Amino acid sequence: VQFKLVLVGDGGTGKTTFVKRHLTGEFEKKYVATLGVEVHPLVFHTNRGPIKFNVWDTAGLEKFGGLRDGYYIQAQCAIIMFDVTSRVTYKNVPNWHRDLVRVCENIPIVLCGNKVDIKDRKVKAKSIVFHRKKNLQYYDISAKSNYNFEKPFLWLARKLIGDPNLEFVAM
């Protein structure tokens, strides 16, 4: 039960920081731009057994895109990420969604607003609506404070299998 999960979004959105926390539990404070893509297996233990996400953490910066949409090929789900401290990143979402689905017809896609821990929220929850019409799931997350940390994965896991009652149990 392995699943390919591409992680896209603007630069500095916290994609790599997010993935890092799930694997090591450490919080990286620095922003070292991702170069093309880097594949990270993530394992979760669920009521029904272990689930493994091969997270293709892709680059959000234009200069380091790499194979771009080429990475999406054969993806089975995805997380579109933006930073609620930066209005620009949300506005680019439709571009990230476009690229992804033109490659991936029907896959579960979660939309995540990262950094909700920063008191100076610029992308108000009221403005976050793009996911409605694309039939996508949305979650506020913080990699720093671990707020709604697993929500994207639990949802994706529930959709990829066929079990709404499925739950992460942790060992």
Binding site: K29, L67, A125
Partner: protein, 1041 residues
């Protein structure tokens, strides 16, 4: 041997085919594949044909090849030989033909086909009208011959529509888009017919859905005649809405049409609504439990439900009053509102937020019509009273069901999270603006409107639900919580007198229920809720001292309650109450001889006994809101002495021991204590305000002595054994004393009100103990919070600390700068913080810069440039503001201004352009254009002198206009002179219309990615030139007098 790179070894395609397979399946060596394939793209593509022309992991490779080709078309197209364009042009169309003309194309993933299509769209984008005149006629024709060809074409036309309308901005210059825009409009009729023909004579379900899906993208822009003047709305509702496999796309279309403004098409909209409802009443019986249907639904009926919720909400939003004003439509309105109510019971957050958006809208609308309750129960004098506003009448009974909805599903008012910080500390973090908290605000607001329109209905609904808890056994914690959250949400929506009667009823029976239910689990839940409720009604408490006192004493009792959560509840409520009722604790109340605060301060220990450290801090903060309400300075000062007597006792004990032996300041337990003492002081400080000076002035100097003792410890430890020493208790705990010392400091100054006093007494000691300590720590030991602390004190003291800016900058400037100038990645918190301080200096202490040596000033400006070149979005824009504020500041210093323009103006320009044209900085566009606009506008009159050294010929404007063109020239040689000259000229014309300036910068970033050549001349360098002068005419019309 993977040292193999692609050049002209006249190489094979099986090898490439092999790496491509690894790129998608292996581990480390799979990073080399990527490395290899992305690395290969340097030279060029003499292989595109080779690969695509020769094949699992063939498509993957042809895809890659298609990728190589797309770069070519989007960047080289214009300078590619005409015969090569045609060749590729025909090669692509051929590739499409055969690939789609294969029934096994269904597994040769759309990935390949779609990509192929996007490639044609790329070509179309570069020459659709000019050198492809027949294209649109042709494809419609082809579509009428082959169903298969029609299928794929509907796909192509949808991609075109997206690139030309939905996504043109950013990827296309404004004038190119405009031309492609009204080009596709000019011959759209032709394809609307193809669509209509397909729709009506249809039989190919795949083709129909595609045409349907291509239709969804046209609705974004196609003239509204095509929409409201055709059989379209009808074909949708009658033909495709009632069939399962078209049910979704169909509704989504209706929703887009529904989103338009009713003005010119009252008829149609009404009809759209009428038909939809009928077709809907058959698809979903008005008795079906949607919540259940959804819950046990699949991936197709769930999206239908949601979509249904989007259609209903959008239509009622835009055309709502149109359904009201007509009497023949009021039935279907009640049916639609009923659907809203069923769908609103779906237990799925995103669907609920959609419905909630409408309910909030209706309520807000009816509240704007009239925010009052109707007359008493009987209509005096017989006749049915006229109180009821016209619109509200139609909703009476739905409003009631909505109230019931708000009460029944009320969201959690508070988002608390357990969070471990940058240390082994695990406190409770309260979120501020989460989607969850927003749901709550919005439900509250909905309920709050509806309570203004009929509070009696709100109180009857809330009362019934309460009784169903007490006896009606609708009992449960989830439900009692939800009832009490609702009950607490409407605080202040009733008149104080109704509020009283209502609250006496709500809590008399929660109290009664509490005694009824057995088990601490139940009593703890019930108890917490009464406390939450009381906490939400200060006005009540405020008017009834005997009850207030009883609640507080009762809260003190529960601070000894062991049952999980209660103590947190008790303290949380206590702080709400101490804030909101602060005066009632400091003034003698009726039936009392002494201020209640007194009784509290004589028992602090007996009360906090059992509380954990964090709760103790909250408790101290609580009492501080009280103490800060006692405005008689003599009494207040005595209050503050007693209040801090416990912490002071420990602190004094520790200070005595450190006098004889600085080693205890190294004792784990004592530094543990020191941090908790300081955390107490910060709370106290935050609560009391300026008057706290009494206490901090008492510990100030010793606190700094210990601060610097701890700072030297940490540094020596790091110097001895490297940063690693940092991941361990004692050091981490020493960081904490330091961090809390700086928070206490900035925390108090922030709130002080005697600047000269702060500058003369509290600032100087900082220099030695804090800033020179920072300078003397080894880099990995320097507390970044020192910089933000200083930033805060500068934002607050302004001119009063201007004189000390030099000493300060001497401590931390160059040393900090050296930690962050070798790269953009290391020491993140210093980068952020160093620039917050520079902003505060620039902002509130600008004369300091006119005080320091030109070489010093230069270093300042270079740091600013350094900041705005940063990749971390925060730093860069902090750098753009500072530069904006600094330029504005300079304009105030006439003397130095001219010397600043002579020395720096052009330079600053180069640095900004280097960032504009850098695709890693588009997040700073607004400020880039904002800064350039201003500087060019400044060229008009601002610079009094000569920059080039010959005044006449090189008039400042000419000089820059030339300096900048030449700048863009050598930097981007591929641009033809006309592009450049048009762009630099517009910098001056649009220099007063920033949003235009923006788009104009955006235009340039598109062009520089694309080698136009010297031949191509489709830049419309005349049509833009009029828009520039049109923006130039407005200039004087913008700013004359």
């Amino acid at each position: 041997a993977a040292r193999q790179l692609l050049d002209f070894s006249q190489k094979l395609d099986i090898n490439l085919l092999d790496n491509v397979v690894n790129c998608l399946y292996h581990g480390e060596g799979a990073q080399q594949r990527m490395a290899q394939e992305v690395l290969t793209h340097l030279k060029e593509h003499p292989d595109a044909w080779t690969r695509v022309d020769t094949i699992s992991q063939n498509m993957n490779t042809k895809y890659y090849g298609l990728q190589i080709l797309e770069n070519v078309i989007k960047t080289r197209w214009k300078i590619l030989p005409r015969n090569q364009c045609e060749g590729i042009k025909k090669y692509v169309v051929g590739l499409i033909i055969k690939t789609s003309s294969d029934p096994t194309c269904v597994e040769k993933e759309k990935v390949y086909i779609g990509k192929l299509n996007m490639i044609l769209v790329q070509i179309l984008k570069q020459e659709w009208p000019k050198h492809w005149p027949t294209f649109i006629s042709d494809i419609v024709g082809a579509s009428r011959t082959s169903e298969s060809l029609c299928q794929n074409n509907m796909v192509i036309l949808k991609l075109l529509s997206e690139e030309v309308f939905d996504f043109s901005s950013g990827q296309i210059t404004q004038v190119k888009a405009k031309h492609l825009k009204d080009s596709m409009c000019n011959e759209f009729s032709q394809i609307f017919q193809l669509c209509q023909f397909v729709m009506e004579n249809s039989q190919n379900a795949p083709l129909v859905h595609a045409t349907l899906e291509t239709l969804l993208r046209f609705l974004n822009w196609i003239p509204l005649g095509y929409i409201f003047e055709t059989k379209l709305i009808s074909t949708l509702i009658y033909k495709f809405l009632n069939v399962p496999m078209f049910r979704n796309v169909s509704l989504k279309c209706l929703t887009e049409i529904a989103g338009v403004s009713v003005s010119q098409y009252e008829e149609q909209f009404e009809t759209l609504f009428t038909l939809t409802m009928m077709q809907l009443k058959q698809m979903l019986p008005l008795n079906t439990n949607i919540r259940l249907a959804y819950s046990n639904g699949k991936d197709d009926e769930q999206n239908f439900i949601q979509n249904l919720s989007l259609f209903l909400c959008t239509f009622l939003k835009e055309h709502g009053q149109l359904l009201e004003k007509r009497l023949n439509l009021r039935e279907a309105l009640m049916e639609a509102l009923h659907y809203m109510l069923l769908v609103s019971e779906v237990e799925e957050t995103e669907i609920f937020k959609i419905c909630l958006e409408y309910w909030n809208h209706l309520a807000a609308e009816l509240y704007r019509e009239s925010p009052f309750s109707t007359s008493a129960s009987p209509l005096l004098s017989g006749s049915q009273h006229f109180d009821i506003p016209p619109r509200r009448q139609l909703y009476l009974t739905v409003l009631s069901k909505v109230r019931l909805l708000m009460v029944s599903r009320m969201a959690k008012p508070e988002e608390v999270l357990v969070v471990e910080n940058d240390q082994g500390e695990v406190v409770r973090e309260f979120m501020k603006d989460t989607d969850s908290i927003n749901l709550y605000k919005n439900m509250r607001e909905t309920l709050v409107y509806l309570t203004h329109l009929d509070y009696v209905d709100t109180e009857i609904i809330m009362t019934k639900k309460l009784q169903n808890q007490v006896n009606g056994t609708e009992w449960s914690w989830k439900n009692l919580n939800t009832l009490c959250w609702a009950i607490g949400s409407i605080s202040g929506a009733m008149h104080e007198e109704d509020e009283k009667r209502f609250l006496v009823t709500v809590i008399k029976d929660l109290l009664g229920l509490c005694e009824q239910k057995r088990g601490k689990d139940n009593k703890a839940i019930i108890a917490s809720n009464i406390m939450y409720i009381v906490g939400q009604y200060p006005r009540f408490l405020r008017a009834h001292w005997k009850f207030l006192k009883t609640v507080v004493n009762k809260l003190f009792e529960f601070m000894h309650e062991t049952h999980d959560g209660v103590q947190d509840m008790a303290c949380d409520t206590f702080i709400k109450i101490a804030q909101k009722c602060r005066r009632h604790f400091v003034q003698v109340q009726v039936g009392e001889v002494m201020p209640f605060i007194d009784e509290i301060l004589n028992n602090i220990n007996t009360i906090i006994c059992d509380l954990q450290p964090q709760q103790v801090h909250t408790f101290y903060e609580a009492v501080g809101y009280m103490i800060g309400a006692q405005t008689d300075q003599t009494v207040q000062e005595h209050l503050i002495e007693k209040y801090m007597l416990l912490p002071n006792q420990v602190w004094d004990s520790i200070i005595q021991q450190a006098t004889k032996n600085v080693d205890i300041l190294k004792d784990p337990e004592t530094v543990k204590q020191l941090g908790s003492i300081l955390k107490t002081n910060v709370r106290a400080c935050k609560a009391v305000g300026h008057p706290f000076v009494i206490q901090l002035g008492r510990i100030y100097l010793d606190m700094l002595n210990v601060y610097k003792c701890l700072s030297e410890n940490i540094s020596a430890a790091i110097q001895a054994n490297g940063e690693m020493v940092t991941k361990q208790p004692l050091i981490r705990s020493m960081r904490t004393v330091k961090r809390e010392t700086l928070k206490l400091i900035s925390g108090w100054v922030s709130r002080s009100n005697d600047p000269q006093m702060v500058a003369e007494n509290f600032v100087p000691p900082l220099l030695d103990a804090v800033l020179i300590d920072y300078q003397r720590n080894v880099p990995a030991a320097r507390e970044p919070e020192v910089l933000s602390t200083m930033a805060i004190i500068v934002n607050k003291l302004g001119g009063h600390i201007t004189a000390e800016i030099p000493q300060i900058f001497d401590a931390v400037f160059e040393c900090t700068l050296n930690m962050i100038n070798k790269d953009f990645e290391e020491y993140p918190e210093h980068r952020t913080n160093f620039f917050l301080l520079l902003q505060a200096v620039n902002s509130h202490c600008f004369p300091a810069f006119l005080a320091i040596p030109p070489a010093q000033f230069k270093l300042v400006l270079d740091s600013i440039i350094w900041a705005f070149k940063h990749t971390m979005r925060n730093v860069a824009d902090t750098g753009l503001q500072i530069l904006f504020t600094l330029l504005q500041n300079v304009a105030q210093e006439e003397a130095a201004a001219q010397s600043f323009y002579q020395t720096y103006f052009c330079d600053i320009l180069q640095h900004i352009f280097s960032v504009v044209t850098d695709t890693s900085h588009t997040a700073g566009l607004t400020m880039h254009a904002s800064i350039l606009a201003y500087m060019f506008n400044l060229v008009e009159e601002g610079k009094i002198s000569t920059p080039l050294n010959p005044g006449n010929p090189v008039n400042n404007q000419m000089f820059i206009q030339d300096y900048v063109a030449n700048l863009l020239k050598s930097a981007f040689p591929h641009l033809q002179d006309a592009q450049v000259k048009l762009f630099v000229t517009g910098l001056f014309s649009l220099n007063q219309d920033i949003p235009a300036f923006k788009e104009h910068l955006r235009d340039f970033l598109v062009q520089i990615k694309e080698f136009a050549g010297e031949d191509t001349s489709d830049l419309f360098l005349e049509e833009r030139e009029t828009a520039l002068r049109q923006a130039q005419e407005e200039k004087h019309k913008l700013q004359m007098s």
